[PDB]
Amino acid sequence: KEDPALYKQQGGEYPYYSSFTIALQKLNISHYDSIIDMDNFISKWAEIGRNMKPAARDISHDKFIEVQKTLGKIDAEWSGYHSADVNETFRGDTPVISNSYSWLAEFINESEGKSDTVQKSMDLEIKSPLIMSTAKDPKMGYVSGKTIMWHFDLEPGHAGVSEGLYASEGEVTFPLYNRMKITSLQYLPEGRSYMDNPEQYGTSHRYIIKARMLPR
Ligand SMILES: [Br-]
Numbered sequence: 001k002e003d004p005a006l007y008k009q010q011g012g013e014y015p016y017y018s019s020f021t022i023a024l025q026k027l028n029i030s031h032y033d034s035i036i037d038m039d040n041f042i043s044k045w046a047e048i049g050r051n052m053k054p055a056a057r058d059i060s061h062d063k064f065i066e067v068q069k070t071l072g073k074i075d076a077e078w079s080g081y082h083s084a085d086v087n088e089t090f091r092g093d094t095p096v097i098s099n100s101y102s103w104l105a106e107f108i109n110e111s112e113g114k115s116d117t118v119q120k121s122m123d124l125e126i127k128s129p130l131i132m133s134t135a136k137d138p139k140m141g142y143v144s145g146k147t148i149m150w151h152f153d154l155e156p157g158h159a160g161v162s163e164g165l166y167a168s169e170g171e172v173t174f175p176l177y178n179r180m181k182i183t184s185l186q187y188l189p190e191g192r193s194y195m196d197n198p199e200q201y202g203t204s205h206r207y208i209i210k211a212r213m214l215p216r
């Protein structure tokens with residue numbers, strides 16, 4: 001009856017996990033179990049982890065092994081986690097994520113400072129490069145003030161779980177490499193609200209990403 005390995009990634013060691021998955025992106029590693037050049041990975045990982053708030057400073061071969069195994073365990077455990085049964089979830093991100101998603105950077109660059117709303121329809125399937133937390137309610141304070149908001153449509157058989165450290169506060173989490181289909185990007189001028197519903201969505205999002213969470 002072990003606690004979910006997911007807790008290890010969500011707590012105070014988050015910067016180590018976050019920086020590890022960032023390193024996987026930066027080095028184009030296909031899978032966390034298939035890291036051929038340990039030394040180069042560790043070096044990059046350490047660089048990223050020193051810039052986190054709070055700083056991930058104890059990066060080493062031991063910490064490498066710990067993080068890799070934990071990621072492994074999270075995926076091994078995944079089917080045993082409580083599936084979330086909501087139809088939709090929401091996420092707030094800062095503009096930093098434009099650095100991970102070139103389609104988003106482009107759309108932001110083209111849209112920025114326009115006086116009217118703009119949508120761009122998409123059909124792009126991606127594998128998510130993080131373990132991604134999402135909220136049931138877009139009003140949560142950690143979502144509502146962010147520049148970018150995702151609006152997730154959960155398809156039956158999706159991989160979102162109500163499990164871990166903030167499950168009792170409405171957090172639904174998705175696994176590393178979770179499949180999603182980007183269907184729409186929207187731009188919202190200052191003062192404008194998603195779906196023109198300020199009371200639900202506020203006025204702080206400039207960009208909305210609509211996406212579908214696909215079966216596991
Ligand atoms: Br992550």
Ligand SMILES: [Cl-]
Binds near residue numbers: 016019053
């Ligand atoms: Cl971090």
Ligand SMILES: [Cl-]
Binds near residue numbers: 051052053
């Ligand atoms: Cl940071």
Ligand SMILES: [Cl-]
Binds near residue numbers: 053054
């Ligand atoms: Cl951070």
Ligand SMILES: [Cl-]
Binds near residue numbers: 103123
């Ligand atoms: Cl595309």
Ligand SMILES: [Cl-]
Binds near residue numbers: 137140169170
């Ligand atoms: Cl709430």
Ligand SMILES: [Cl-]
Binds near residue numbers: 135136137169170171
């Ligand atoms: Cl929530």
Ligand SMILES: [Cl-]
Binds near residue numbers: 136137169170
């Ligand atoms: Cl909630």
Ligand SMILES: [Cl-]
Binds near residue numbers: 195
């Ligand atoms: Cl809605």
Ligand SMILES: [Cl-]
Binds near residue numbers: 197
């Ligand atoms: Cl609405």
Ligand SMILES: [Pt+2]
Binds near residue numbers: 015018
């Ligand atoms: Pt960070």
Ligand SMILES: [Pt+2]
Binds near residue numbers: 038039061064
């Ligand atoms: Pt090593």
Ligand SMILES: [Pt+2]
Binds near residue numbers: 121123
């Ligand atoms: Pt696109």
Ligand SMILES: [Pt+2]
Binds near residue numbers: 136137140169170
């Ligand atoms: Pt909530």
Ligand SMILES: [Pt+2]
Binds near residue numbers: 140141
């Ligand atoms: Pt909250």
Ligand SMILES: [Pt+2]
Binds near residue numbers: 195197
């Ligand atoms: Pt709506």
